[PDB]
């Protein structure tokens, strides 16, 4: 399933959950 509508998939920065706080269209924690 999609972790966030900003990251693709299998994002290590979203593997242990969702450490993405940046945004939805563009973040800066999974650049
Ligand atoms: Cd994201
Ligand atoms: Cd991510
Ligand atoms: Cd996420
Ligand atoms: Cd991020």
UniProtKB/Swiss-Prot annotation:
Binding site for a divalent metal cation 7: 20, 27, 29-30
Positions of post-translational Phosphoserine modification: 28
Binding of a divalent metal cation 4, residues: 3-4, 14, 18
Keywords from the UniProt entry: Acetylation, Cadmium, Metal-binding, Metal-thiolate cluster, Phosphoprotein, Zinc
GO molecular function per UniProt: metal ion binding; zinc ion binding
A single cellular component GO annotation: nucleus
Residues binding a divalent metal cation 5, per UniProt: 4, 6-7, 20
GO biological process: cellular response to cadmium ion; cellular response to copper ion; cellular response to erythropoietin; cellular response to interleukin-3; cellular response to zinc ion; detoxification of copper ion; intracellular copper ion homeostasis; intracellular zinc ion homeostasis
Subunit structure: Interacts with EOLA1.
Family according to the record: Belongs to the metallothionein superfamily. Type 1 family.
UniProt domain comment: Class I metallothioneins contain 2 metal-binding domains: four divalent ions are chelated within cluster A of the alpha domain and are coordinated via cysteinyl thiolate bridges to 11 cysteine ligands. Cluster B, the corresponding region within the beta domain, can ligate three divalent ions to 9 cysteines.
Protein name as it appears in the record: Metallothionein-2
Native source species: Homo sapiens
Shown part of the complete sequence: 31 to 61 of 61
């Amino acid at each position: 399933k999609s972790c966030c509508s900003c990251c693709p998939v299998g994002c290590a920065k979203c593997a242990q959950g969702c450490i993405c706080k940046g945004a939805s269209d563009k973040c800066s924690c999974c650049a």
